[PDB]
Tab-separated table of all heavy atoms in Angstrom:
chain	number	residue	atom	x	y	z
A	166	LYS	N	-1.389	17.230	-11.019
A	166	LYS	CA	-0.780	18.500	-11.431
A	166	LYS	C	0.572	18.653	-10.612
A	166	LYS	O	0.393	18.734	-9.392
A	166	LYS	CB	-1.673	19.659	-11.256
A	166	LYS	CG	-1.136	21.061	-11.575
A	166	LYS	CD	-0.513	21.131	-13.036
A	166	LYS	CE	-0.357	22.505	-13.405
A	166	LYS	NZ	0.696	23.226	-12.663
A	167	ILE	N	1.697	18.823	-11.310
A	167	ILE	CA	3.033	19.146	-10.653
A	167	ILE	C	3.059	20.654	-10.460
A	167	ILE	O	2.731	21.360	-11.495
A	167	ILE	CB	4.108	18.581	-11.376
A	167	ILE	CG1	3.975	17.155	-11.772
A	167	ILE	CG2	5.495	18.814	-10.575
A	167	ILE	CD1	5.085	16.575	-12.679
A	168	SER	N	3.407	21.224	-9.347
A	168	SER	CA	3.609	22.721	-9.044
A	168	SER	C	5.009	22.854	-8.433
A	168	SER	O	5.033	23.417	-7.302
A	168	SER	CB	2.440	23.277	-8.260
A	168	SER	OG	2.698	24.519	-7.996
A	169	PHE	N	5.986	22.431	-9.061
A	169	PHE	CA	7.449	22.659	-8.692
A	169	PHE	C	7.745	21.907	-7.402
A	169	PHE	O	8.565	22.359	-6.598
A	169	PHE	CB	7.779	24.157	-8.637
A	169	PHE	CG	7.543	24.887	-9.924
A	169	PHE	CD1	6.328	25.509	-10.178
A	169	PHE	CD2	8.520	24.886	-10.903
A	169	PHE	CE1	6.185	26.100	-11.449
A	169	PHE	CE2	8.355	25.518	-12.108
A	169	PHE	CZ	7.071	26.119	-12.355
A	170	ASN	N	7.043	20.783	-7.106
A	170	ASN	CA	7.159	19.977	-5.802
A	170	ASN	C	8.534	19.531	-5.640
A	170	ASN	O	9.083	19.035	-6.641
A	170	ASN	CB	6.175	18.765	-5.921
A	170	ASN	CG	4.746	19.113	-6.071
A	170	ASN	OD1	4.343	19.704	-7.088
A	170	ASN	ND2	3.883	18.777	-5.062
A	171	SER	N	9.095	19.784	-4.511
A	171	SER	CA	10.479	19.314	-4.086
A	171	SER	C	10.293	18.623	-2.675
A	171	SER	O	9.242	18.943	-1.958
A	171	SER	CB	11.461	20.387	-4.016
A	171	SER	OG	11.093	21.398	-3.189
A	172	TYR	N	11.182	17.763	-2.330
A	172	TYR	CA	11.121	16.782	-1.176
A	172	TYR	C	12.519	16.922	-0.371
A	172	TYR	O	13.496	16.546	-0.914
A	172	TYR	CB	10.735	15.435	-1.660
A	172	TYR	CG	9.406	15.442	-2.335
A	172	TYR	CD1	9.321	15.741	-3.759
A	172	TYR	CD2	8.264	15.271	-1.702
A	172	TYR	CE1	8.127	15.793	-4.407
A	172	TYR	CE2	6.982	15.331	-2.297
A	172	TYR	CZ	6.939	15.606	-3.683
A	172	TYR	OH	5.765	15.671	-4.295
A	173	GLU	N	12.350	17.419	0.830
A	173	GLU	CA	13.480	17.649	1.733
A	173	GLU	C	13.468	16.594	2.876
A	173	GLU	O	12.531	16.490	3.592
A	173	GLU	CB	13.372	19.104	2.430
A	173	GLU	CG	14.414	19.419	3.392
A	173	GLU	CD	14.217	20.735	4.078
A	173	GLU	OE1	13.092	21.372	3.981
A	173	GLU	OE2	15.191	21.175	4.858
A	174	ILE	N	14.542	15.764	2.844
A	174	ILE	CA	14.821	14.772	3.922
A	174	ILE	C	15.456	15.608	5.160
A	174	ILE	O	16.356	16.452	4.842
A	174	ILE	CB	15.760	13.652	3.521
A	174	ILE	CG1	15.126	12.834	2.417
A	174	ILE	CG2	16.133	12.718	4.714
A	174	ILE	CD1	16.120	11.976	1.689
A	175	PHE	N	15.060	15.387	6.350
A	175	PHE	CA	15.819	15.756	7.528
A	175	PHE	C	15.527	14.820	8.701
A	175	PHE	O	14.348	14.439	8.916
A	175	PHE	CB	15.578	17.232	7.940
A	175	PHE	CG	14.137	17.557	8.344
A	175	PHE	CD1	13.818	17.501	9.678
A	175	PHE	CD2	13.150	17.889	7.466
A	175	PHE	CE1	12.525	17.804	10.129
A	175	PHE	CE2	11.885	18.277	7.890
A	175	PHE	CZ	11.487	18.190	9.278
A	176	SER	N	16.559	14.339	9.364
A	176	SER	CA	16.461	13.422	10.660
A	176	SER	C	16.261	14.480	11.749
A	176	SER	O	17.009	15.513	11.886
A	176	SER	CB	17.711	12.695	10.827
A	176	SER	OG	17.725	12.020	12.109
A	177	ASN	N	15.299	14.166	12.652
A	177	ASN	CA	14.971	14.826	13.894
A	177	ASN	C	15.802	14.170	15.061
A	177	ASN	O	15.795	14.681	16.159
A	177	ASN	CB	13.523	14.943	14.219
A	177	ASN	CG	12.766	15.881	13.327
A	177	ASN	OD1	13.179	17.034	13.189
A	177	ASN	ND2	11.670	15.440	12.725
A	178	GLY	N	16.501	13.090	14.719
A	178	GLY	CA	17.336	12.278	15.652
A	178	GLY	C	17.266	10.806	15.267
A	178	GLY	O	16.318	10.154	15.576
A	179	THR	N	18.259	10.357	14.430
A	179	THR	CA	18.255	9.076	13.725
A	179	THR	C	18.401	7.924	14.643
A	179	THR	O	19.362	7.875	15.354
A	179	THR	CB	19.324	9.000	12.614
A	179	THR	OG1	19.175	10.175	11.755
A	179	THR	CG2	19.153	7.842	11.709
A	180	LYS	N	17.387	7.009	14.664
A	180	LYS	CA	17.492	5.748	15.373
A	180	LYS	C	18.002	4.589	14.386
A	180	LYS	O	17.262	4.392	13.367
A	180	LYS	CB	16.112	5.403	15.982
A	180	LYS	CG	16.199	4.226	16.979
A	180	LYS	CD	15.906	2.888	16.360
A	180	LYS	CE	16.143	1.704	17.367
A	180	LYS	NZ	15.875	0.411	16.739
A	181	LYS	N	19.088	3.971	14.755
A	181	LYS	CA	19.725	2.885	13.913
A	181	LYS	C	18.858	1.569	14.119
A	181	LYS	O	18.546	1.276	15.332
A	181	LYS	CB	21.129	2.641	14.274
A	181	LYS	CG	22.046	3.880	14.146
A	181	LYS	CD	23.539	3.601	13.973
A	181	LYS	CE	24.344	4.794	13.724
A	181	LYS	NZ	25.365	4.550	12.681
A	182	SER	N	18.536	0.882	13.073
A	182	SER	CA	17.757	-0.403	13.118
A	182	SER	C	18.607	-1.516	12.580
A	182	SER	O	19.351	-1.299	11.614
A	182	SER	CB	16.430	-0.256	12.314
A	182	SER	OG	15.616	0.728	12.875
A	183	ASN	N	18.476	-2.713	13.131
A	183	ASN	CA	18.977	-3.983	12.623
A	183	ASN	C	18.164	-4.388	11.381
A	183	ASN	O	17.003	-4.084	11.379
A	183	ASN	CB	19.047	-5.055	13.679
A	183	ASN	CG	19.949	-6.261	13.292
A	183	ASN	OD1	19.939	-6.752	12.253
A	183	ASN	ND2	20.949	-6.593	14.170
A	184	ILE	N	18.888	-4.899	10.324
A	184	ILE	CA	18.225	-5.343	9.097
A	184	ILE	C	17.102	-6.388	9.458
A	184	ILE	O	16.060	-6.356	8.709
A	184	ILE	CB	19.214	-5.888	8.109
A	184	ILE	CG1	18.617	-5.879	6.632
A	184	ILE	CG2	19.812	-7.228	8.464
A	184	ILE	CD1	18.374	-4.535	5.996
A	185	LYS	N	17.367	-7.314	10.420
A	185	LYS	CA	16.367	-8.300	10.850
A	185	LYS	C	15.051	-7.667	11.457
A	185	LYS	O	13.987	-8.152	11.134
A	185	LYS	CB	17.016	-9.275	11.908
A	185	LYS	CG	17.927	-10.277	11.253
A	185	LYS	CD	18.609	-11.228	12.296
A	185	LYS	CE	19.482	-12.310	11.591
A	185	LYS	NZ	19.699	-13.405	12.441
A	186	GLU	N	15.238	-6.540	12.106
A	186	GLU	CA	14.071	-5.751	12.757
A	186	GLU	C	13.237	-5.217	11.673
A	186	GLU	O	12.043	-5.398	11.616
A	186	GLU	CB	14.633	-4.647	13.682
A	186	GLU	CG	15.421	-5.220	14.899
A	186	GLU	CD	16.020	-4.044	15.676
A	186	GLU	OE1	16.376	-2.966	15.176
A	186	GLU	OE2	16.206	-4.246	16.891
A	187	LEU	N	13.926	-4.463	10.748
A	187	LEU	CA	13.242	-3.821	9.505
A	187	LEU	C	12.486	-4.853	8.713
A	187	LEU	O	11.316	-4.537	8.375
A	187	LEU	CB	14.360	-3.142	8.687
A	187	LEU	CG	15.045	-1.914	9.278
A	187	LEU	CD1	16.143	-1.397	8.412
A	187	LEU	CD2	13.967	-0.788	9.562
A	188	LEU	N	13.067	-6.051	8.435
A	188	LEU	CA	12.486	-7.134	7.628
A	188	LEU	C	11.230	-7.712	8.339
A	188	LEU	O	10.260	-7.934	7.745
A	188	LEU	CB	13.546	-8.100	7.262
A	188	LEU	CG	14.443	-7.728	6.085
A	188	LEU	CD1	15.650	-8.680	6.024
A	188	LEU	CD2	13.788	-7.576	4.761
A	189	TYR	N	11.407	-8.019	9.706
A	189	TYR	CA	10.318	-8.584	10.472
A	189	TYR	C	9.119	-7.753	10.497
A	189	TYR	O	7.985	-8.262	10.176
A	189	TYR	CB	10.768	-8.882	11.913
A	189	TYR	CG	9.736	-9.748	12.660
A	189	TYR	CD1	9.858	-11.108	12.675
A	189	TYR	CD2	8.672	-9.167	13.254
A	189	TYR	CE1	8.883	-11.880	13.422
A	189	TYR	CE2	7.684	-9.876	13.978
A	189	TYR	CZ	7.819	-11.291	13.950
A	189	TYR	OH	6.901	-11.998	14.593
A	190	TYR	N	9.200	-6.426	10.698
A	190	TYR	CA	8.098	-5.460	10.700
A	190	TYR	C	7.380	-5.488	9.334
A	190	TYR	O	6.109	-5.564	9.309
A	190	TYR	CB	8.497	-4.054	11.006
A	190	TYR	CG	7.381	-3.036	10.920
A	190	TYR	CD1	6.662	-2.660	12.053
A	190	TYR	CD2	7.011	-2.455	9.736
A	190	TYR	CE1	5.616	-1.770	11.972
A	190	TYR	CE2	6.003	-1.547	9.683
A	190	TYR	CZ	5.231	-1.161	10.805
A	190	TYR	OH	4.244	-0.310	10.757
A	191	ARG	N	8.168	-5.442	8.231
A	191	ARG	CA	7.707	-5.448	6.815
A	191	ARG	C	6.882	-6.716	6.539
A	191	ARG	O	5.740	-6.627	6.047
A	191	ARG	CB	8.832	-5.294	5.800
A	191	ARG	CG	9.002	-3.828	5.364
A	191	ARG	CD	9.241	-2.826	6.497
A	191	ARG	NE	9.412	-1.595	5.875
A	191	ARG	CZ	10.604	-1.131	5.373
A	191	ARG	NH1	11.726	-1.913	5.515
A	191	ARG	NH2	10.735	0.059	4.861
A	192	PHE	N	7.459	-7.840	6.901
A	192	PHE	CA	6.835	-9.188	6.617
A	192	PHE	C	5.665	-9.503	7.510
A	192	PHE	O	4.662	-10.081	6.992
A	192	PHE	CB	7.935	-10.332	6.681
A	192	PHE	CG	8.630	-10.473	5.352
A	192	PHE	CD1	9.815	-9.738	5.070
A	192	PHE	CD2	8.130	-11.327	4.361
A	192	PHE	CE1	10.505	-9.904	3.900
A	192	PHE	CE2	8.864	-11.431	3.138
A	192	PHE	CZ	10.041	-10.773	2.937
A	193	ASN	N	5.726	-9.051	8.707
A	193	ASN	CA	4.464	-9.154	9.667
A	193	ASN	C	3.382	-8.303	9.076
A	193	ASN	O	2.193	-8.814	8.975
A	193	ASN	CB	4.859	-8.728	11.107
A	193	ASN	CG	3.744	-8.750	11.994
A	193	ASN	OD1	3.228	-9.869	12.272
A	193	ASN	ND2	3.256	-7.656	12.520
A	194	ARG	N	3.691	-6.988	8.764
A	194	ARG	CA	2.700	-6.049	8.154
A	194	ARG	C	2.076	-6.635	6.839
A	194	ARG	O	0.876	-6.607	6.648
A	194	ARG	CB	3.269	-4.677	7.845
A	194	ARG	CG	2.236	-3.680	7.315
A	194	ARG	CD	2.955	-2.275	7.083
A	194	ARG	NE	4.032	-2.314	6.184
A	194	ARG	CZ	4.915	-1.298	6.021
A	194	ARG	NH1	4.729	-0.147	6.706
A	194	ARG	NH2	5.868	-1.409	5.102
Side-chain angles (χ1 to χ4, degrees):
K166 179 53 165 66
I167 313 173
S168 179
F169 301 94
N170 301 62
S171 60
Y172 302 87
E173 178 185 7
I174 300 164
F175 67 91
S176 176
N177 287 309
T179 309
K180 192 269 171 182
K181 306 204 178 221
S182 299
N183 197 306
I184 196 71
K185 284 181 179 200
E186 299 174 328
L187 290 176
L188 284 169
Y189 189 93
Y190 178 94
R191 262 53 177 280
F192 273 90
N193 181 64
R194 183 177 58 192

